[PDB]
Design a protein around this ligand. Structure first.
Ligand SMILES: Nc1nc2c(ncn2[C@@H]2O[C@@H]3COP(=O)(O)O[C@H]4[C@@H](O)[C@H](n5cnc6c(=O)[nH]c(N)nc65)O[C@@H]4COP(=O)(O)O[C@H]3[C@H]2O)c(=O)[nH]1
Ligand SMILES: [Mg+2]
Ligand SMILES: [Mg+2]
Length: 90
RNA sequence: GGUCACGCACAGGGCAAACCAUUCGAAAGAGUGGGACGCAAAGCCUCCGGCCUAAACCAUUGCACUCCGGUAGGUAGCGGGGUUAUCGAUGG
């Protein structure tokens, strides 16, 4: 069930999108070349983030290394992406 | 002459985008002064659609790459609608 993208939920929702990406990017750049980080704060898509990696191995690396990680007072709930991104599926 | 539409003007004007200064605001943004991009209602009003904001409240653990909660505020120079008003092409 591995994927280029990893799905994080259970995040402090009152963190601004602009800032939020960077906070993850600094934490997650260390595993591979991140193509893009998708973050929204709409009713459905808040408190959660998608991180797209260059390598699938790098997404696996990030997943098994930081599960439950205390991030903004909250544990990081990471799981694989069920479906790839529109930028990958091509 | 009203009145209701119309804008090809005349004459008298009026308002003031951006930007800057300053104040308020969490922000969008607004106030004031300077400034003029434009505007025949660019006068005034959030009732209706859009767009902008997200500090606090309230709900949501939620799988996206169209965008989307209530709540609240903003935009009348985003339309729509409302309401008042000016000049008057041998004007219609
Ligand atoms: N008195 C009067 N005259 C009218 C009216 N409608 C049309 N006109 C005449 O027609 C010209 C052009 O009007 P416009 O195409 O709406 O274009 C206008 C308009 O967009 C703008 N403007 C001037 N005054 C006002 C105003 O009080 N309100 C608004 N919204 N726009 C204005 O400047 C442009 C040129 O205006 P002008 O040099 O005065 O020249 C005007 C004026 O001579 C009206 O309701 N009243
Ligand atoms: Mg004139
Ligand atoms: Mg509205």
């Amino acid at each position: 069930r591995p994927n280029h993208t990893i799905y994080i939920n259970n995040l402090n929702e009152k963190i601004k999108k602009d800032e939020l990406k960077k906070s993850l990017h600094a934490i997650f750049s260390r595993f591979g070349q991140i193509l893009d980080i998708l973050v929204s704060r709409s009713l459905k898509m808040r408190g959660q983030a998608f991180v797209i990696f260059k390598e699938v191995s790098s997404a696996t690396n990030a997943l098994r290394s930081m599960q439950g990680f205390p991030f903004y007072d909250k544990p990081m709930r990471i799981q694989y992406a069920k479906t790839d991104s529109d930028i990958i599926a091509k």
